[PDB]
C-alpha cells in the first residue's frame, strides 16, 4: 500500500476486508487523527 494522488489530493485506498472489519460503508463519516506517529481512523 502507498499514498496516491486522487485529484491533487493524497489518498490511501482501503481494502474490502478492512471496510468489513469496521462495518464501514462508502461515505461513512470517520474521525482521522495522529496518535503515536500513526494515522488513526475510526468510524463515527
Amino acid at each position, epitope marked *: 500500500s502507498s499514498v496516491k494522488r486522487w485529484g491533487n489530493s493524497p489518498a490511501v485506498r482501503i*481494502p*474490502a*476486508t*478492512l471496510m*468489513q*472489519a*469496521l*462495518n464501514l460503508n462508502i461515505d461513512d463519516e470517520v474521525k482521522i487523527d495522529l496518535v503515536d506517529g500513526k494515522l488513526i481512523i475510526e468510524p463515527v
Partner: nanobody
Framework: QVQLVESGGGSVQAGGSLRLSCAASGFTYSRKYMGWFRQAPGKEREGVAAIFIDNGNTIYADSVQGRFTISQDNAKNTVYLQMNSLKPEDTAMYYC???????????????????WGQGTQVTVSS
C-alpha cells in the same frame, strides 16, 4: 502463514445444534480474519461466516445468518462456528480458513484467504 485444524464434525438430527472448532498454529499473530466455508454435495464451496481477529466483528452469509454464529478465543488461537437449528441443506464439509493480509476481496469469499484447513464433515439427517 498458519496451519488449521477443524474438529467437531458429526451427524446431527435436523433442528439440532453442533459446534465446530478451528485451531490455528504457526504465525498466529499474523491472522487478520478467519472464516468458515462449506461444500455441500456436488456444489461449489461457499463462505458462511468470518470473524476479524482484532475486534471480534463478524459477518455472515444470508444462508446462515441468525442460525450460525462465529466466535473466537484469541488466547487459544481458536475460532468456533456454533450452529443452531440445523437443516438437511446444511450438510457439507466445513472448512476453516485464515488470512494474514487485508485482501481486497470480501471475507466471505475464498480469494480473501491464504491458509486452509482440511475440513470437518457435518451431516444433518432429514
Amino acid at each position: 502463514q498458519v496451519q488449521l485444524v477443524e474438529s467437531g464434525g458429526g451427524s446431527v438430527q435436523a433442528g439440532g445444534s453442533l459446534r465446530l472448532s478451528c485451531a490455528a498454529s504457526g504465525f498466529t499473530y499474523s491472522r487478520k480474519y478467519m472464516g468458515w466455508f462449506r461444500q455441500a454435495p456436488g456444489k461449489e464451496r461457499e463462505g458462511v461466516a468470518a470473524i476479524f481477529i482484532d475486534n471480534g466483528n463478524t459477518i455472515y452469509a444470508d444462508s446462515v445468518q441468525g442460525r450460525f454464529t462465529i466466535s473466537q478465543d484469541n488466547a487459544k488461537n481458536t475460532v468456533y462456528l456454533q450452529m443452531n437449528s440445523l437443516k438437511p441443506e446444511d450438510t457439507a464439509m466445513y472448512y476453516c480458513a485464515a488470512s494474514s493480509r487485508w485482501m481486497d476481496y470480501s471475507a466471505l469469499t475464498a480469494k480473501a484467504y491464504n491458509s486452509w484447513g482440511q475440513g470437518t464433515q457435518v451431516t444433518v439427517s432429514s
